[PDB]
Symmetry: C5
């Protein structure tokens, strides 16, 4: 298995690493139908989503999507610095595939 | 996908944005049959609900309804300021579609 | 839907509101067979349970019973003040239907 | 239903209350197959388990076993003092049936 | 049942104890398909994973894998010191079987 977020991210096409090195500025959560998602922003203005679960996801990703949203909320609330995001860049806002944090 | 709670809110009929800019003043949770819901209030006097799951909701909203209640509870306990609420105004009290928090 | 805990409580038979205006004094949780329940007490001497799930509950209450136990635990741990409890008075100890918190 | 951990523990024939009055010293968690369990210790040296699920349990205990492990972790992390443990003392380590905490 | 992580770790082939005695340096979480996993690192240079669920896991391990990831997140966020890890050494990076914390 990969040993770093960059190694993992490189296994996928249409992805890139953002080096965030910052805490989340805003957290947005929606339960509206067909928009069941989370959006985060940083003081850089950069904005990222956890996508609504769809047919682009395999069954094993369903729990992992829910976990990713749990992680972003608690990351927001604790003011924890995010190090990198691995994101798909074929989505607007770019879509999170993985996150890393260091202290 | 939308980039902000206002953009997302505007995709739905019968909604409006409340700019709260404040922590939750009271949190109410019911496990009484047919009233399995959460109600929050603010110092300003406003009251909002997370509706009981019902036939107006689509399957994808089930998990998101539960997440929203989770979010409201930890937001309350941590005295986290809510920025905006996207609510449906055809319900009494108005019904939460989305929330945002800024730091 | 109701706007307050008292409104909600009054929709049900065999209920009453206790005004607690205090943090939980003690929290007890059991995984013992037939006694899978939570008990809370207050310095006033007042004791309440979340009932063991049973045939008196409907399916929409299953998640909500688990949520209520979750809420009592974290409310205890954080020394959060409880405003009111809606309880069923045809159980001993009285059984929690709904809870509100407010400082 | 019981109103205290003592009353509850008295309904079982191989149980014992351990008066702990202390925070958890160590927390151990395993996901190893057939050893999916939690072990806690205290400075007194006293060691306790949440048993692996099996035929010593009835179905109603399954969610409660997961809850109890959730409780021990957050109790450990928050340095929360445990008052009492009701345990089955026919197991090594003694097996947790219920927990109480007071402040 | 085992009374310590050391005893437990000894019941498995291809495992060893790592004495960590430190907080986690970095946390990585992926929801990318076929890489739904968590990676942790320490200042010692060691890297460990919670494996992607797979045919090597038995049904009783599926909730325990999710729990372990939950534990690693909150341990990271709270700067909690890890005592030992029981890991499988037939995986790269080595795969977490059990964790102990004291502190
Ligand atoms: O999500 C939509 O596309 C939608 C379409 C038509 C009505 C609508 O709102 C109703 O359902 C929501 C919950 O999804 C809420 O209860 C509103 O009060 C309803 O009007 C949403
Ligand atoms: O929720 C109702 O409309 C209802 C109907 C009949 C009985 C009832 O209360 C009983 O169940 C609650 C749990 O939902 C509690 O155990 C009471 O003690 C029971 O009487 C509610
Ligand atoms: O003594 C009793 O009344 C009693 C009832 C049900 C189970 C029980 O203990 C056994 O099961 C628990 C877990 O439910 C635990 O493993 C004990 O070690 C078992 O003896 C006692
Ligand atoms: O697994 C989710 C992933 O699925 C595909 O790879 C898409 O191209 C991405 O944009 C993303 O949605
Ligand atoms: O239970 C998980 C465990 O399963 C097997 O025994 C493998 O050999 C280990 O590498 C580990 O993956």
């Amino acid at each position: 298995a990969p040993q770093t977020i960059t190694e993992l991210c490189s296994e996928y096409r249409n992805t890139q690493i953002y080096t965030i090195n910052d805490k989340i500025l805003s957290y947005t959560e929606s339960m509206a139908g067909k928009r069941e998602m989370v959006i985060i922003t940083f003081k850089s203005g950069e904005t990222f989503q956890v996508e609504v679960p769809g047919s682009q996801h395999i069954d094993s990703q369903k729990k992992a999507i829910e976990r990713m949203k749990d992680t972003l909320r608690i990351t927001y609330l604790t003011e924890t610095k995010i190090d990198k995001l691995c994101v798909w860049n074929n989505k607007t806002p770019n879509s999170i595939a993985a996150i890393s944090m260091k202290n």
